[PDB]
Design a protein around this ligand. Structure first.
Ligand code: MG
Ligand code: MG
Ligand code: MG
Ligand code: MG
Ligand code: MG
Ligand code: MG
Ligand code: MG
Ligand code: MG
Ligand code: MG
Ligand code: MG
Lengths: 125, 187, 53, 225, 48
RNA sequence: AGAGUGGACGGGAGCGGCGGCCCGGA
RNA sequence: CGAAAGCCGCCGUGGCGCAAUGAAGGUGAAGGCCGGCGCGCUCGCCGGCCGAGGUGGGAUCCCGAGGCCUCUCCAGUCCGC
RNA sequence: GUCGGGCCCGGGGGAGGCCACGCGCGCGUCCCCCGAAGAGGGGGACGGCGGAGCGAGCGCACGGGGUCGG
């Protein structure tokens, strides 16, 4: 259960970083990277995360499968998107909203995707 | 400057359980939501009793709850205690009951179930009756224990019946002067 | 005054009025006219000092 | 559903707007009535005294039913009886005035705390300035600025007191609900007296401030609020 | 017997005023039809 | 789109407002 | 690591609790109702049920007269405050 | 006698100020006239009375705590 697992890992977790007045989390499916019940990547039935791609071009969106909830090998389905910026934001927005797959992390995934894209694009002098 | 005393400003009361029990914390969250967003004084009483300590939540006996359900007008109501249902071996037959408790001992639970009743926890109580309707809210005897036998006026005063603090019970342990008129005085 | 209150409430209930039952602490003093009756008020005046005792 | 629902909520909004307009018209008329009553009372007192002078007699007016009291000494070195009377008067700070209703019991406890307060009889202008500028109400044990007739009506509408004009009318013409209105009013926290006091620690009739200045309390209230 | 006696005893039976009108209309339940009348008379036009 | 200071339909029986050659009805 | 951990149950002996009181011999914690009969004697005979008494307060819960509505009326359908 | 009170009790008439007064039709309530019972009718004024949905469209501001498109 999400609430029980949160009451467990709320203060004791290997992803927790408490340093000077701030608290962060480093689990691999954590948009906004904060110690919260909403933005926890392990305790929910449905989770969406975004990362940079394997090569330095594009964004991989990983969502949690419904069925294999106790089998962590097959429990995540990830897709790489190497389009342009407006289409990748529109595609992940369509994915979240039209699947109705946890539609409160939508804008957080949007901010994270735009940050990853802007970091991926080449640096100007 | 204003003339007020500040020694009674902070009210000494529980605002959360002292426990680190996560299941208790979860149902305190649930009943805190219910007491806030509901007009149920039942939910408010259940919340503050959830905050309370273990001595303030004495165990309720099965026979005592049988009597309080047997009281008139309480047919097919849900008996609710926030505390522990213990068994009473002094009662031979058990009627069917719909109880809700934080904790039920093994033999009390077996006796209720094989008598043919239902036992609820507080989450399924909130599913069944979220307002608290059709409930009888009991409690155990909060002043039945040995510390309350020892509290009160001092034992060497009249006319107190306060248990003294003696290291053994016998004819040599605090029965002389002060306890009978043939040794000084009696009071 | 308890028995007086009870009889007063009974008479008020049967006769259909509302009457006062409490008592009130000595109100102020209800504006009024003071007749001089034609004559002028007498002029008072402090006395001189004389030592007797 | 999206047409009957919207016309229903539009009808509800219209009815609430009409109720607001009705209550506004009511409070307007009430204030007009009180203006008539005040001017009638003022001219009535002047006419009574003038009639007694024409007849050759004396007109003794009614000794007032309303007093404004101000705690004017601090909280250091106070007798316990004086302390208890001042906190029954709700004067817990210095320059901390309030309204009292004058009878024998109240006058005797003022006589108890004579050298700590300055008190007197306020006029209608003083009650206007006090309730409008420094008007705070007690709403579930909080001190809330009187900015809203809704606030006044939600606390005191069960006595027919639904506006600040109704409050001022009760306090000035001490009604049957004067206790409730005066207890609704938080005690007024006045400023320091602009211009000074000429001596704090002696009675007003011997050159100080303490005691009963009769209508010079209005001069003090102008300087102090 | 006393309850029967009291039971048979209790069954043995048989201008304008503008400010008051303003309070009546400003009442929330009583003044509903009155301010409805005021509203439709403010916004309706039939001659004569 | 979640919308409730009461909402239900459903025969029951008439209006105000939109569609006339007086017949209406998501 | 582990001098830890696990297990015993015909290993619960024992401790503390479940009963007190008396110096001690010792004794040792449930009532009411309904019927008959003595002498229903301030009370036994048997029988029947019920199960720790009563009063005043008492959080909570239960019933609830009557109210509050819907374009609108006529006869009831549902739940809500 | 009263710039008194009675939502300034009221009614009539003649070359101004004020009002947070202004849909119907029917009912009531009050008043006037013919009144041929002072009946039945011709009218006016008041109402908090009577089954039946809804004005919107721009602004300005002493208006639920500072902005400048200086
Ligand atoms: Mg301070
Ligand atoms: Mg201190
Ligand atoms: Mg001093
Ligand atoms: Mg100066
Ligand atoms: Mg001194
Ligand atoms: Mg071992
Ligand atoms: Mg044992
Ligand atoms: Mg043994
Ligand atoms: Mg006049
Ligand atoms: Mg007139």
């Amino acid at each position: 259960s999400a609430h029980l697992q949160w009451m467990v890992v709320r203060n004791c977790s290997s992803f927790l970083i408490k340093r000077n007045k701030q608290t962060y989390s480093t689990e691999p499916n954590n948009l906004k990277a904060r110690n919260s019940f909403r933005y926890n990547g392990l305790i929910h039935r449905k989770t969406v995360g975004v990362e940079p791609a394997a090569d330095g071009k594009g964004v991989v969106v990983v969502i949690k499968r419904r069925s294999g909830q106790r089998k962590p090998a097959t429990s995540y389905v990830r897709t790489t998107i190497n389009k342009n910026a407006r289409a990748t934001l529109s595609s992940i927005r369509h994915m979240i909203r039209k699947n109705k797959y946890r539609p409160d992390l939508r804008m957080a995934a949007i901010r994270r995707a735009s940050a990853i894209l802007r970091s991926q694009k080449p640096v100007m002098v | 400057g204003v003339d007020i005393r500040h020694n009674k400003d902070r009210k000494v009361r529980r605002k959360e359980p002292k426990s680190q029990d996560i299941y208790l914390r979860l149902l305190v969250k649930l009943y805190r939501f219910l007491a806030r967003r509901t007009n149920s004084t039942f939910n408010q009483v259940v919340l503050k009793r959830l905050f309370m300590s273990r001595t303030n939540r004495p165990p309720l006996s099965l026979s005592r709850m049988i009597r309080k359900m047997k009281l008139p007008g309480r047919e097919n109501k849900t008996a609710v205690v926030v505390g522990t249902i213990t068994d009473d071996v002094r009662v031979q037959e058990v009627p069917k009951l719909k109880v809700c408790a934080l904790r039920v001992t093994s033999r009390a639970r077996s006796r209720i179930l094989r008598a043919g009743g239902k036992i609820l926890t507080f989450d399924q109580l909130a599913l069944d009756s979220p307002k608290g309707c059709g409930t009888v809210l009991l409690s155990g005897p909060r002043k039945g224990r040995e510390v309350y036998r020892h509290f009160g006026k001092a034992p060497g005063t009249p006319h107190s019946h306060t248990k003294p603090y003696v290291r053994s019970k016998g004819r040599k342990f605090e029965r002389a002067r002060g306890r009978r008129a043939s040794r000084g005085y009696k009071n | 005054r308890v028995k007086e209150n009870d009889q007063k409430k009974k008479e008020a209930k049967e006769k259909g009025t509302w009457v006062q039952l409490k008592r009130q602490p000595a109100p102020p003093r209800e504006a009024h006219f003071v007749r001089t009756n034609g004559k002028e008020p007498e002029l008072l005046e402090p006395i001189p000092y004389e030592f007797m005792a | 559903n999206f047409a009957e629902l919207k016309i229903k909520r539009l009808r509800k909004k219209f009815a609430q707007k009409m109720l607001r307009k009705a209550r506004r018209k009511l409070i307007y008329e009430k204030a007009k009535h009180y203006h008539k009553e005040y001017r009638q009372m003022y001219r009535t007192e002047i006419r009574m005294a003038r009639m007694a002078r024409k007849a050759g007699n004396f007109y003794v007016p009614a000794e007032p039913k309303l007093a404004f009291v101000i705690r004017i000494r601090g909280i250091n070195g106070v007798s316990p009886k004086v302390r208890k009377v001042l906190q029954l008067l709700r004067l817990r700070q210095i320059f901390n005035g309030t309204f009292v209703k004058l009878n024998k019991a109240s006058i005797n406890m003022l006589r108890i705390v004579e050298p700590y307060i300055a008190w007197g009889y306020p006029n209608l202008k003083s009650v206007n300035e006090l309730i409008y500028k420094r008007g705070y109400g007690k709403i579930n044990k909080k001190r809330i600025a009187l900015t809203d007739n809704a606030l006044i009506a939600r606390s005191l509408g069960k006595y027919g007191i639904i506006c600040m004009e109704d409050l001022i009318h009760e306090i000035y013409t001490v009604g049957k609900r004067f206790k409730e209105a005066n207890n609704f009013l938080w005690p007024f926290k006045l400023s320091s007296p602009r211009g000074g006091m000429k001596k704090k620690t002696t009675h007003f009739v011997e050159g100080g401030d303490a005691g009963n200045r009769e209508d010079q309390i209005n001069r003090l209230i102008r300087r102090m609020n | 017997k006393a309850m029967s006696a009291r039971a048979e005893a209790i069954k043995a039976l048989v201008v304008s005023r503008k400010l008051d009108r303003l309070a009546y209309i400003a009442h929330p339940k009583l003044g509903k039809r009155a301010r409805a009348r005021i509203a439709k008379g403010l916004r309706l036009c039939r001659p004569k």
